[PDB]
Design an enzyme around this catalytic site. Structure first.
Site, PDB file in Angstrom:
ATOM      1  N   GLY A   1       0.792  -1.222   0.000  1.00 28.13           N
ATOM      2  CA  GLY A   1       0.000   0.000   0.000  1.00 28.13           C
ATOM      3  C   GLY A   1       0.824   1.271   0.000  1.00 28.13           C
ATOM      4  CB  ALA A   2       4.350   1.754  -0.477  1.00 29.79           C
TER       5      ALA A   2
ATOM      6  CE  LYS B   1      -5.504  -2.546   9.883  1.00 32.33           C
ATOM      7  NZ  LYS B   1      -4.311  -2.900   9.064  1.00 32.33           N
TER       8      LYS B   1
ATOM      9  CE1 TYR C   1      -8.804  -0.563   9.004  1.00 32.74           C
ATOM     10  CE2 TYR C   1      -9.311   0.096  11.242  1.00 32.74           C
ATOM     11  CZ  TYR C   1      -8.426   0.030  10.183  1.00 32.74           C
ATOM     12  OH  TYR C   1      -7.156   0.560  10.297  1.00 32.74           O
TER      13      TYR C   1
ATOM     14  CB  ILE D   1      -6.881  11.046  14.746  1.00 29.59           C
ATOM     15  CG1 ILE D   1      -7.287  12.376  14.112  1.00 29.59           C
ATOM     16  CG2 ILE D   1      -5.546  11.196  15.472  1.00 29.59           C
ATOM     17  CD1 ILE D   1      -8.660  12.354  13.490  1.00 29.59           C
TER      18      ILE D   1
ATOM     19  CG  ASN E   1       0.691   1.096   4.923  1.00 25.17           C
ATOM     20  OD1 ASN E   1       0.308   1.730   5.908  1.00 25.17           O
ATOM     21  ND2 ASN E   1       0.497   1.526   3.686  1.00 25.17           N
TER      22      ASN E   1
ATOM     23  CB  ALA F   1     -13.608  -8.096  13.149  1.00 26.90           C
TER      24      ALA F   1
END
Ligand SMILES: NC(=O)c1ccc[n+]([C@@H]2O[C@H](COP(=O)([O-])OP(=O)(O)OC[C@H]3O[C@@H](n4cnc5c(N)ncnc54)[C@H](O)[C@@H]3O)[C@@H](O)[C@H]2O)c1
Ligand SMILES: NC(=O)c1ccc[n+]([C@@H]2O[C@H](COP(=O)([O-])OP(=O)(O)OC[C@H]3O[C@@H](n4cnc5c(N)ncnc54)[C@H](O)[C@@H]3O)[C@@H](O)[C@H]2O)c1
Lengths: 251, 251, 251, 244
Positions: free
Chosen positions: C12-13, C161, C157, C190, C89, C159
């Site tokens: 995801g970079a 993680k 989301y 945030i 990521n 769950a």
């Protein structure tokens, strides 16, 4: 009469620890929905409960299938009027073959998540409208000691129970607005009638050295905390994980 | 009869939550030693319990004083033959004046640790011989939600309850060899008949925002987990911390 | 040069915090594989790094696709000879719309888990051979503060993680026999990803109210711990979760 | 230069891991106050650091003594103008003889708490005014793996480090209003015969022997600006003895 005038759905209740939850919950006055993928065996559990003076029905369910889950809840409400308690005990575990995580196919990963993580999620969705309508509910999700200990050769199982563990937190927040509690029980080392490849001889040697109480577990070691969490008197406890592990780990 | 034929020492039991523990334990069949620094007032709780059909004595104790603690346990054994359960509820808490940590004197720090941390330690030492002799025991130590939340203006109280929290782990290991369990209960937000300045109005607004269950607590929110932990059925649980906090924090 | 003569894959970079990881790792001497579903955008990032003096290639990857993941690792080894570091990521989060958990379909659940949970798992499998052969590896998985806080409207989301969080424990055990470490970073939600619009001042004040540290956070706040966890300075740390949250929660 | 133009007080720094913290902090540009009950040995550490081009002074301190602690902070500010970093490393542990908890007297309990828990508290009090004035502080408190594992025969030590662990949370709240961070490092208690190493390795996920270099990296992170958004956390360096 710890659960007098309450209705509990227990998934995966045709055998093993879930069967004991069903039997003991009915002994404590709960009307029990014995929910399982194996309808004949679930019927044997429910018939055993009814023949001893308790209230129980069997419901076939595939917890990975949303309409099967909805039908299960419908059957509970048709029989007993409501659902007070959901125990998400159904899981793929006893049938697992131990293997290094490199050998776990994506398909095996997905199939196990569909039952263990998604299935718990779907059941929580299906009881939400009845519990919100009545502004009452006890949801008990089931994790495992291996989430914290990271024991080898079951990496997808461990990750799926990590999903359940985190899901409890989200659901405690979202459902607590209607007073519904959501908690996680994390068992360790519980021997039942179902043989499993989970813990080897060298694995038990390590567990006993690490435990504070030097013995293996059985179902009677879990029933008490389940009765507390399912009962009215746990009303202030939500979003917690309770480990039953003979002090394998400390919190 | 959750505690039938069991003997429980509860320290700090002359008022507040400890008085409720004593009254409820005695209702469940426990022979209760109402231990407190106020002997006549502890005698008042014990007399009320006996007038309702329960078994109870009072015992004067300064839990910071090893000789006083030893005489308390001797009194329990003299009256009831054994000690099955110890609840280390005595603490300096409701009397505390809130202050930034820079304003806490070393003598204030020491005096609070003498009761809250050392006092719990001395009581556990004093019940160890009888619990080991009988190869049975339930020790419940009391921490506080502020250990995890780090709320301001009580830094010495928070540190003293962190000492209790860690002590439970050491004692779970050392006493588990004889089957004795040692666990910690971490209450939050429990309103009693005793006023206290621990939480302000702005503090309650913050707590209610963070809690999953939007209400304050009371003693009935805690009795259930104390009954579980003090009962035979918690036999497999040791070295754990159980937070009763309406979901203020999640675990 | 804290990552000199090291090779790092970051998924995801092509944008957001993953791009910053790639750019900062390259500044510290790492050869970086900018892996992303968007190959043209990843190539842009790689070109930016190289024209500034770093070493970088782009690799298109669908982390939910085992063959795509395997091709990414082949590209890394073919270009740079080894893989030392993997940062998982890639995640679905920015595109998510807030919805109560009852409104999340099973298909929506599955699609998010396929990237967030299975995707991390597949990438760890693919780097395992090269890291084991070299007796060296640093794997950094990514969770989020929303797991511990149970923020509403992101239940799938959260769950997913949780699954990553537990998976790190299993992988630390299974890979630690060959000198590979596996850790999890949990950023404050945030600062989980770079916002499209600047957080309003009123929104910042609501966030600061929950923080112990009264300071605004940004992406530089995650780079430091990633550099630690990717470097030899963390060679003794494995199976841990490190939260970068200004004391939103305490551990 | 990760600690360039910063001042660090390290208690218990005349020997052991505290000495290595001081040496490595000085190598990274910190002006170091080598604080220890043994002033001669601490002076030898400071002189060793100074002869290698670093900046250091020695300060005698009894961390259980509020007047001694205050003199320590005054000495640091006298030499270096400020205090940026406090590492509360002083602790009673190596001298401890193992004993079941029933055999620990109240006096032994109190004496250990006076150094391990109260001592950390008093040092945090003493650096608070200078850190609040400068709107900057990194405080690193020290726990131990034995807290989470509940190792036998050290019950008062374990309890004292639980006090430190919780104190970090309270101080992160109270000092975070002024930009000061407070965190806890929990080293593996092992940091020995080969048979002993193998018993310890059995419990670790990472099958590697640990030493002092394994703690320096996280201390440098927590003492530097790279950790400016981290507060109230406990970081375990234990090769996966436990997981978090
Ligand atoms: N509906 C479905 O799709 C589905 C799929 C698979 C299995 N199941 C059902 O679930 C049941 C499985 O029973 P079983 O014997 O495999 O498991 P079990 O009787 O041991 O169930 C234990 C539950 O607790 C968890 N757990 C983890 N560690 C534990 C421990 N040490 N002790 C106790 N529980 C622990 C398990 O993951 C599971 O959720 C069966 O009745 C089966 O029909 C349902
Ligand atoms: N030396 C001694 O023997 C000694 C010293 C001091 C106090 N005590 C006794 O202990 C009792 C103290 O009662 P109290 O009113 O101060 O305390 P309380 O009844 O409100 O609380 C009892 C216990 O719960 C803990 N707690 C944690 N979170 C709490 C919460 N949300 N609300 C309430 N308690 C919480 C307290 O720290 C304490 O350990 C009195 O009977 C007093 O006489 C004994």
């Amino acid at each position: 009469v710890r659960l007098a005038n309450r209705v509990a759905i227990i998934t995966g209740a045709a055998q093993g620890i879930g069967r004991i939850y069903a039997e003991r919950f009915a002994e404590e006055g709960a009307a029990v929905v014995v929910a399982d993928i194996n309808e004949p065996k679930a019927t044997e559990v429910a018939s055993s409960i009814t023949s001893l003076g308790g209230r129980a029905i069997a419901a076939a369910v595939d917890v990975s299938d949303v309409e099967s889950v909805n039908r299960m809840v419908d059957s509970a409400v048709e029989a007993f009027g409501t659902v007070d308690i959901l125990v998400n005990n159904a899981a793929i575990f006893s049938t697992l073959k131990m293997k290094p995580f490199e050998e776990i196919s994506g398909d095996e990963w997905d199939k196990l998540f569909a039952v263990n993580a998604k299935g718990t999620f779907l059941c929580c969705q299906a009881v939400s409208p009845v519990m919100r309508k009545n502004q009452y509910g006890r949801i008990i999700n089931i994790s495992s000691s291996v989430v914290v200990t990271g024991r080898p050769n079951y990496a997808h199982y461990i990750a799926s129970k990590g999903a359940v563990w985190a899901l409890t937190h989200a659901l405690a927040t979202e459902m607590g607005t209607d007073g519904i509690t959501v908690n996680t029980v994390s068992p360790h080392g519980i021997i039942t009638e179902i043989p499993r490849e989970t813990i080897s001889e060298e694995g038990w040697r390590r567990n006993l050295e690490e435990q504070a109480l030097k013995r293996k577990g059985d179902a009677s070691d879990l029933v008490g905390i389940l009765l507390y969490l399912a009962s009215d008197e746990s009303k202030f406890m939500t979003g917690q994980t309770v480990a039953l592990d003979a002090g394998l780990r400390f919190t």
